[PDB]
Amino acid sequence: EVQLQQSGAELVKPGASVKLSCTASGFNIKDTYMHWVKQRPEQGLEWIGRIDPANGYSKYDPKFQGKATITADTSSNAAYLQLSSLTSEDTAVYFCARDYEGFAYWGLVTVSSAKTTPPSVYPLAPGAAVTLGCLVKGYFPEPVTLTWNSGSLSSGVHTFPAVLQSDLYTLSSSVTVTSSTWPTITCNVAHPASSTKVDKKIE
């Protein structure tokens, strides 16, 4: 239908730049307004501004200026943006929207020192011969998609939060499957940043 689509992820050395991208799919960007919101760990939402494609004009929230600068164009592509002399707090997610009178349809950035390092996943299981799970530890860039079998081992899963020993991460996730007959299982973990999809079966 109509699909505003932002660009995967990205990371940067403190005091640098980035250039997110919000690719609208079914409407001519010109047609309306487009936004850029911000959201971090727990902090609610903070409006970074709006832009009117047609006449290039655009207003922002005062203290966000020096940083970013929204801009999409009169031509063929999507609505972009970019912050500068970045800090640590700005290390967080950004969204884009379009409808004046209620953002109907919308669309992670990190500031760091040490680069991407594959995570380490070990399946964690026991018994006495249901209740199981699998562990993941020692990765950095903040995203880690964790799936159990396909998505056919769902409505039972418990992906627990990221955990932080400094400038390296750790996480566990349990799919409590009291489900009767172990047999194989598997643990599809996914690390977008160092580009890694792993898997480990069990028992």
Partner 1 sequence: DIVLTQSPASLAVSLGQRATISCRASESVVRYGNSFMHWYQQKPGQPPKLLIYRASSLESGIPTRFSGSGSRTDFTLTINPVEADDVATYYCQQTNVDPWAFGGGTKLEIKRADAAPTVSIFPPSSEQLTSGGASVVCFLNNFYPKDINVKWKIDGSERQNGVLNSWTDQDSKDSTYSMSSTLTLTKDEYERHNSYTCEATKSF
Partner 2 sequence: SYSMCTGKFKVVKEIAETQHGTIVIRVQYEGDGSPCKIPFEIMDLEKRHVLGRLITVNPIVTEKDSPVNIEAEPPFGDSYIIIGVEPGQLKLNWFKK
* Cβ atoms of 34 and 72 closer than 8 Å: yes
Binding pattern to partner 1, positions 95-134, x when CB under 8 A? Answer: x----xxxxx-xx--------------xxxxx----x-xx
> Which residue of 135, 144, 189, 193 would you call a contact of partner 1, by CB under 8 A?
135
Cα–Cα distance between 179 and 176 in angstroms, integer? 8
What's 160's DSSP letter? P
Residues that bind partner 2 (CB under 8 A): 1-2, 26-28, 31-33, 52, 98-102
Least distance (Å) between residue 177 CB and partner 1: 11
Residues 6+ apart with CB under 8 A from 124: 132, 133, 134, 135, 172
* Cβ atoms of 121 and 186 closer than 8 Å: no
Closest CA to 123 of 115, 114, 135, 111: 135
What's 199's DSSP letter? -
Least distance (Å) between residue 75 CB and partner 1: 26
* Cβ atoms of 10 and 91 closer than 8 Å: no
Nearer to partner 1, 5 or 17 (CB): 5
The item of partner 2, partner 1, none sharing an interface with residue 170, based on CB under 5 to 8 Å by kind, is: partner 1
The item of partner 2, partner 1, none sharing an interface with residue 167, based on CB under 5 to 8 Å by kind, is: none
Residues 62-81 that bind partner 1 (CB under 8 A): 62
* Cα-based torsion angle of the residue sequence 11, 64, 69, 88 in order, rounded to the nearest 10 degrees: -10
Cα–Cα distance between 72 and 112 in angstroms, integer? 27
The item of partner 2, partner 1, none sharing an interface with residue 50, based on CB under 5 to 8 Å by kind, is: partner 1
The item of partner 1, partner 2, none sharing an interface with residue 182, based on CB under 5 to 8 Å by kind, is: none
> Which residue of 12, 92, 137, 196 would you call a contact of partner 1, by CB under 8 A?
137
Burial class (CB in 10 A: 0-12, 13-18, 19+), 86: buried
Query: Quick check: 170 binds partner 1 (CB under 8 A)?
Result: yes
Phi, psi of 13 (to 5 degrees): -70, 135
**Contacting residues toward partner 1, per CB under 8 A:** 37, 44-47, 50, 59, 61-62, 95, 100-104, 106-107, 122-126, 131, 133-135, 137, 155, 158-161, 163, 165, 170, 172, 174, 176
